[PDB]
């Protein structure tokens, strides 16, 4: 199936004293593999997956150098944005950046991303063609003119279509034992009586990887969304994911209801009944 590599970066200004709190994380699909935290003692990019530990001290030097440079870019940005938005030196603000690439089942380039937010709102994003920018407001428009003049999009396109895809392929091969393994959801159904006339059926999906999954309910073979509750997919903490979907039913009519599970690790979707 499809694969991705993504890096996420957050800086939060500290107006009273010093530099922003900066946290950077890198992922392959739904597996974190690197991190940097400005509050941590090491001041190095650190491994978070066994397969990246195969990389030499040169990799760790280069990645630490880039990530510390990124922290400085965010520090300068927080200052520039305070100016663009006529804000006081007294409040804490946040800058967030995410970039990366998507590849299909053939591991060939599918899509590239490079986007920025200020205080949780869109600021500037590279468009899908990797040639132009979406600037949300006039402050971001001044950034867009600066980046067009310096041909920033061309540099990003080369990394996104090239380097990003090339290194994603490397990690997929190196971490094949886990990265290329799909973990099908372990499913079961629970039943909870609310009164003598109402019951809740809860369909569980546990221990799956990747995180993408669909859980749906049917009544007599027809889709049922009314009287259903679906929780957000959540991490188990061991690298896998969990989700549940519940339906409220009249007591005694449990047999009409079926839960349907779709996941990459299941050749055909699963059906569960009470």
């Amino acid at each position: 199936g499809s694969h991705s590599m993504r890096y996420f970066f957050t800086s939060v200004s500290r107006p009273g004293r010093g530099e922003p709190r900066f946290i950077a994380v890198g992922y392959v699909d739904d597996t974190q593999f690197v991190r940097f935290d400005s509050d941590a003692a090491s001041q190095r990019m650190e491994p978070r997956a066994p397969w990246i530990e195969q990389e030499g001290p040169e990799y760790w030097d280069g990645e630490t150098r880039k990530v510390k440079a990124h922290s400085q870019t965010h520090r300068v940005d927080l200052g520039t944005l305070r100016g663009y938005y006529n804000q006081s030196e007294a409040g804490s603000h946040t800058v967030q950046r995410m970039y990366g690439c998507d590849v299909g089942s053939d591991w060939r380039f599918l899509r590239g991303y490079h986007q920025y937010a200020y205080d949780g709102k869109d600021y500037i994003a590279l468009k899908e063609d990797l040639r132009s920018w979406t600037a949300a407001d006039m402050a971001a428009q001044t950034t867009k003119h600066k980046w067009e003049a310096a041909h920033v999009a061309e540099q990003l396109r080369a990394y996104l279509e090239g380097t990003c895809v090339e290194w994603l392929r490397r990690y997929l091969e190196n971490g094949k034992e886990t990265l290329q393994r799909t973990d099908a959801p372990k499913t079961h159904m629970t039943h909870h009586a609310v009164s003598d006339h109402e019951a809740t059926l809860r369909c569980w999906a546990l221990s799956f990887y990747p995180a993408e999954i669909t859980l749906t309910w049917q009544r007599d073979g027809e889709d049922q969304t009314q009287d259903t509750e679906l929780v957000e997919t959540r991490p188990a903490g061991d690298g896998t994911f969990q989700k549940w979907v519940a339906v409220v039913v009249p007591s005694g009519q449990e047999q009409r209801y079926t839960c349907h599970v779709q996941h990459e690790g299941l050749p055909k979707p699963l059906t569960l009944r009470w």
Partner: peptide, 9 residues
């Protein structure tokens, strides 16, 4: 592997 060069806003 991260992007080799950065750019400020």
């Amino acid at each position: 592997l991260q992007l080799p060069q950065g750019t400020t806003l």
